[PDB]
Write a protein that holds these residues in place. Structure first.
Motif, PDB file in Angstrom:
ATOM      1  N   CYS A   7     -56.205 -67.706 -54.562  1.00  0.00           N
ATOM      2  CA  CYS A   7     -55.458 -66.956 -53.572  1.00  0.00           C
ATOM      3  C   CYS A   7     -54.006 -67.386 -53.575  1.00  0.00           C
ATOM      4  O   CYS A   7     -53.110 -66.548 -53.398  1.00  0.00           O
ATOM      5  CB  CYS A   7     -56.082 -67.121 -52.194  1.00  0.00           C
ATOM      6  SG  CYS A   7     -57.633 -66.160 -52.015  1.00  0.00           S
ATOM      7  N   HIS A   8     -53.754 -68.668 -53.868  1.00  0.00           N
ATOM      8  CA  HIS A   8     -52.367 -69.113 -53.946  1.00  0.00           C
ATOM      9  C   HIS A   8     -51.635 -68.318 -55.012  1.00  0.00           C
ATOM     10  O   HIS A   8     -50.578 -67.725 -54.747  1.00  0.00           O
ATOM     11  CB  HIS A   8     -52.303 -70.611 -54.242  1.00  0.00           C
ATOM     12  CG  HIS A   8     -50.906 -71.132 -54.363  1.00  0.00           C
ATOM     13  ND1 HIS A   8     -50.209 -71.639 -53.289  1.00  0.00           N
ATOM     14  CD2 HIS A   8     -50.063 -71.182 -55.420  1.00  0.00           C
ATOM     15  CE1 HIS A   8     -49.002 -72.000 -53.684  1.00  0.00           C
ATOM     16  NE2 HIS A   8     -48.887 -71.731 -54.971  1.00  0.00           N
ATOM     17  N   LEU A   9     -52.236 -68.229 -56.208  1.00  0.00           N
ATOM     18  CA  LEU A   9     -51.607 -67.466 -57.279  1.00  0.00           C
ATOM     19  C   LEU A   9     -51.372 -66.033 -56.842  1.00  0.00           C
ATOM     20  O   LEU A   9     -50.285 -65.477 -57.049  1.00  0.00           O
ATOM     21  CB  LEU A   9     -52.471 -67.502 -58.538  1.00  0.00           C
ATOM     22  CG  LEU A   9     -52.503 -68.803 -59.329  1.00  0.00           C
ATOM     23  CD1 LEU A   9     -53.933 -69.280 -59.485  1.00  0.00           C
ATOM     24  CD2 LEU A   9     -51.854 -68.585 -60.686  1.00  0.00           C
ATOM     25  N   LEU A  10     -52.370 -65.427 -56.190  1.00  0.00           N
ATOM     26  CA  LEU A  10     -52.227 -64.023 -55.851  1.00  0.00           C
ATOM     27  C   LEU A  10     -51.220 -63.835 -54.725  1.00  0.00           C
ATOM     28  O   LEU A  10     -50.497 -62.833 -54.706  1.00  0.00           O
ATOM     29  CB  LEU A  10     -53.593 -63.432 -55.485  1.00  0.00           C
ATOM     30  CG  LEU A  10     -54.590 -63.320 -56.647  1.00  0.00           C
ATOM     31  CD1 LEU A  10     -55.944 -62.899 -56.116  1.00  0.00           C
ATOM     32  CD2 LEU A  10     -54.112 -62.329 -57.696  1.00  0.00           C
TER      33      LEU A  10
ATOM     34  N   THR B 283     -52.716 -57.481 -45.925  1.00  0.00           N
ATOM     35  CA  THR B 283     -51.867 -57.688 -47.097  1.00  0.00           C
ATOM     36  C   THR B 283     -51.972 -59.106 -47.660  1.00  0.00           C
ATOM     37  O   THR B 283     -51.098 -59.532 -48.421  1.00  0.00           O
ATOM     38  CB  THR B 283     -50.409 -57.368 -46.769  1.00  0.00           C
ATOM     39  OG1 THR B 283     -49.938 -58.279 -45.769  1.00  0.00           O
ATOM     40  CG2 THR B 283     -50.286 -55.941 -46.254  1.00  0.00           C
ATOM     41  N   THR B 284     -53.036 -59.833 -47.328  1.00  0.00           N
ATOM     42  CA  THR B 284     -53.200 -61.232 -47.692  1.00  0.00           C
ATOM     43  C   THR B 284     -54.487 -61.418 -48.485  1.00  0.00           C
ATOM     44  O   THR B 284     -55.526 -60.862 -48.127  1.00  0.00           O
ATOM     45  CB  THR B 284     -53.253 -62.104 -46.436  1.00  0.00           C
ATOM     46  OG1 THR B 284     -52.052 -61.912 -45.676  1.00  0.00           O
ATOM     47  CG2 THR B 284     -53.402 -63.571 -46.802  1.00  0.00           C
ATOM     48  N   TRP B 285     -54.418 -62.220 -49.538  1.00  0.00           N
ATOM     49  CA  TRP B 285     -55.624 -62.669 -50.223  1.00  0.00           C
ATOM     50  C   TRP B 285     -56.203 -63.868 -49.476  1.00  0.00           C
ATOM     51  O   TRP B 285     -55.547 -64.912 -49.355  1.00  0.00           O
ATOM     52  CB  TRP B 285     -55.295 -63.004 -51.670  1.00  0.00           C
ATOM     53  CG  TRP B 285     -54.740 -61.835 -52.411  1.00  0.00           C
ATOM     54  CD1 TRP B 285     -53.417 -61.512 -52.578  1.00  0.00           C
ATOM     55  CD2 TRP B 285     -55.492 -60.812 -53.073  1.00  0.00           C
ATOM     56  NE1 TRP B 285     -53.305 -60.354 -53.315  1.00  0.00           N
ATOM     57  CE2 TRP B 285     -54.563 -59.904 -53.629  1.00  0.00           C
ATOM     58  CE3 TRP B 285     -56.863 -60.572 -53.244  1.00  0.00           C
ATOM     59  CZ2 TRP B 285     -54.959 -58.781 -54.357  1.00  0.00           C
ATOM     60  CZ3 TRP B 285     -57.258 -59.446 -53.967  1.00  0.00           C
ATOM     61  CH2 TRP B 285     -56.302 -58.574 -54.521  1.00  0.00           C
TER      62      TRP B 285
ATOM     63  N   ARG C  87     -54.472 -63.197 -69.616  1.00  0.00           N
ATOM     64  CA  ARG C  87     -53.438 -64.208 -69.844  1.00  0.00           C
ATOM     65  C   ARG C  87     -53.482 -65.297 -68.778  1.00  0.00           C
ATOM     66  O   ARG C  87     -53.371 -66.491 -69.091  1.00  0.00           O
ATOM     67  CB  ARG C  87     -52.057 -63.553 -69.881  1.00  0.00           C
ATOM     68  N   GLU C  88     -53.654 -64.909 -67.511  1.00  0.00           N
ATOM     69  CA  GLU C  88     -53.651 -65.892 -66.434  1.00  0.00           C
ATOM     70  C   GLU C  88     -54.867 -66.802 -66.504  1.00  0.00           C
ATOM     71  O   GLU C  88     -54.753 -68.010 -66.269  1.00  0.00           O
ATOM     72  CB  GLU C  88     -53.580 -65.193 -65.078  1.00  0.00           C
ATOM     73  CG  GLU C  88     -52.231 -64.564 -64.807  1.00  0.00           C
ATOM     74  CD  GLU C  88     -51.105 -65.574 -64.912  1.00  0.00           C
ATOM     75  OE1 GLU C  88     -51.137 -66.582 -64.171  1.00  0.00           O
ATOM     76  OE2 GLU C  88     -50.202 -65.370 -65.752  1.00  0.00           O
TER      77      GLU C  88
ATOM     78  N   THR D  75     -50.041 -57.277 -55.218  1.00  0.00           N
ATOM     79  CA  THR D  75     -50.549 -57.097 -53.862  1.00  0.00           C
ATOM     80  C   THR D  75     -50.214 -55.707 -53.328  1.00  0.00           C
ATOM     81  O   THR D  75     -51.084 -55.010 -52.784  1.00  0.00           O
ATOM     82  CB  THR D  75     -49.984 -58.180 -52.941  1.00  0.00           C
ATOM     83  OG1 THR D  75     -50.595 -59.435 -53.256  1.00  0.00           O
ATOM     84  CG2 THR D  75     -50.261 -57.842 -51.478  1.00  0.00           C
ATOM     85  N   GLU D  76     -48.957 -55.279 -53.487  1.00  0.00           N
ATOM     86  CA  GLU D  76     -48.567 -53.959 -52.985  1.00  0.00           C
ATOM     87  C   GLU D  76     -49.340 -52.841 -53.689  1.00  0.00           C
ATOM     88  O   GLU D  76     -49.784 -51.870 -53.049  1.00  0.00           O
ATOM     89  CB  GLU D  76     -47.060 -53.758 -53.163  1.00  0.00           C
TER      90      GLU D  76
END
Ligand SMILES: CCCCCCCCCCCCCCCC(=O)OC[C@H](O)CO
Ligand SMILES: CCCCCCCCCCCCCCCC
Ligand SMILES: *[C@@H]1O[C@H](CO)[C@@H](O)[C@H](O)[C@H]1NC(C)=O
Ligand SMILES: O=S(=O)([O-])CC[NH2+]C1CCCCC1
Ligand SMILES: O=S(=O)([O-])CC[NH2+]C1CCCCC1
Ligand SMILES: O=S(=O)([O-])CC[NH2+]C1CCCCC1
Ligand SMILES: CCCCCCCCCCCC
Ligand SMILES: CCCCCCCCCC
Lengths: 97, 280
Positions: B141-144, B125-127, B76-77, B152-153
């Motif tokens: 990465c902004h989207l994620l 914990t960062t893309w 979908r994304e 992410t969790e």
């Protein structure tokens, strides 16, 4: 960028005429994954082949193992044929005992 | 052993054009494929009797549901944020999993490539976007980082906790396979001619497991300096193949032998003498 496949052909056992064996074709180092690999007997595609699921190395280039059960004879010629976007024509690597 | 061991899930998908894609996925314990994915039914294919890795059917079913939800969201994304025909075809690779270090410390990772180049990775914990992948990497990465916090969790827990637990469960469930010894066979052949009056001697060693092996061309107890070892290549059924080659002048090949040492051989090396055309 696009990386051209490397092709290695080898038998599982020493070649002995009339004895059942396996022919392997290991195709590696290519990108993108779209590829046509066929094992050939006397220039004709072999249907009863098996292949690994697509995988890739740390540099992201892809690799596949193909294998087929065959009985070598003096008159039969076996090969691995690969086509890929990087190749101007299909590459055929013959197996030699 | 102190050897590091890893478990990976990989995904490969390609968009041929704006509205058509295909994909594949699989699971690997070091270099051994342990799992496939049936994309029609969207379910895990367990390739070995021990592939459930001591997880319960409920745990595995929940993981399957998670993967299907991931695939739905990804589709979908991509469709929403796609549409110039010059960008197609493109191919994405995902590699997620864990490495267990010698002391038991786990290390998780989640790395993505786009058209064969690094795109982004998951760090703590960062893309984190790859610099070389420029604005696309930054966009993804902004989207994620800002629109899927639950994702992410979930990824953090999958690669840091679920993955090492599964990896070790696989090693335990598969202990009779992973600790097996398979004896190689060896044979000699001639390779491509190095030149007039020269021979290429080839020692083939096939069907050994595990991978550590020793092969050399010898004259008596003296190792021959020109010996070249090929890449160790896979056989079906989990064993390996290696060619050891030596170029020699005609009239100097007699007396040379190939010697093979492997853990499975229990001290009795394989020794083969080159015969070539020497015997009438
Ligand atoms: C990430 C750490 C997870 C640790 C626990 C893992 C348990 C077993 C997973 C193996 C399944 C491999 C198949 C998954 C492939 C997949 O989901 O990709 C579909 C393709 O995209 C089809 O289009
Ligand atoms: C603008 C056209 C190309 C779009 C490329 C999209 C690549 C998407 C990569 C993200 C893969 C999943 C990341 C992890 C999700 C949990
Ligand atoms: C997109 O690619 C698929 C797969 O090759 C093809 O069947 C389809 O017709 C294409 N759609 C277009 C060009 O709009
Ligand atoms: O069988 S199949 O049609 O090749 C499965 C394709 N599903 C993937 C397409 C690309 C986005 C992620 C999901
Ligand atoms: O043992 S190992 O060197 O860590 C395995 C490296 N190749 C794997 C990377 C991704 C999964 C497919 C196989
Ligand atoms: O022979 S070897 O490549 O050194 C062994 C490394 N990995 C193995 C152990 C876990 C099961 C997969 C195969
Ligand atoms: C549930 C995971 C969704 C991942 C979305 C990544 C695809 C976004 C493409 C953005 C292109 C600018
Ligand atoms: C490990 C392969 C990708 C799994 C991502 C699942 C998280 C998305 C659902 C919240």
């Amino acid at each position: 960028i696009q990386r051209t496949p490397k092709i290695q052909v080898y038998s599982r056992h020493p070649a002995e005429n009339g004895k059942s064996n396996f022919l392997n074709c290991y195709v590696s180092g290519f990108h993108p994954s779209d590829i046509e690999v066929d094992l050939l007997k006397n220039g004709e595609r072999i249907e009863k082949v098996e292949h690994s699921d697509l995988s890739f190395s740390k540099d992201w280039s892809f690799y596949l193992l193909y294998y087929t059960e065959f009985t070598p004879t003096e008159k039969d010629e076996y090969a691995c044929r690969v086509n890929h976007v990087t190749l101007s024509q299909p590459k055929i690597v013959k197996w030699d005992r | 052993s102190q050897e590091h061991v890893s478990f990976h899930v990989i995904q490969i998908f390609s968009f041929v054009n704006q509205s058509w894609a295909r994909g594949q996925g699989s699971g690997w314990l070091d270099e051994l494929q342990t799992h496939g994915w049936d994309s029609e039914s969207g379910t895990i294919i367990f390739l070995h009797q021990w592939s459930k890795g001591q997880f319960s059917n409920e745990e595995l079913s929940d993981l399957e549901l998670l993967f299907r939800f991931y695939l739905f969201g990804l589709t979908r994304e991509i469709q929403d944020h796609a549409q110039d025909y010059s960008k197609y075809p493109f191919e994405v690779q995902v590699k997620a999993g864990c490495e267990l270090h010698s002391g038991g410390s786990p290390e998780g990772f989640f790395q993505v490539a786009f058209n064969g180049l690094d795109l982004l990775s998951f760090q703590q914990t960062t893309w984190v976007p790859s610099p070389g992948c420029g604005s696309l990497a930054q966009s993804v990465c902004h989207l994620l980082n800002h629109q899927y916090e639950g994702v992410t969790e979930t990824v953090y827990n999958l690669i840091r906790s679920t993955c090492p637990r599964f990896l070790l469960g696989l090693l335990d469930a598969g202990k009779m396979y992973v600790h097996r010894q398979v004896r190689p066979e060896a044979w000699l052949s001639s390779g491509p001619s190095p030149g007039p009056g020269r021979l290429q001697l080839v020692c083939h060693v096939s069907g050994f497991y595990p991978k550590p092996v020793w092969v050399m061309w010898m004259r008596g107890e003296q190792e021959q300096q020109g010996t070249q070892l090929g890449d160790i290549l896979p056989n079906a059924n989990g064993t390996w193949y290696l060619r050891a080659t030596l170029d020699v002048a005609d009239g100097e090949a007699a007396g040379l032998s190939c010697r093979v040492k492997h853990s499975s051989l229990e001290g009795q090396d394989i020794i083969l003498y080159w015969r070539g055309s020497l015997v009438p």
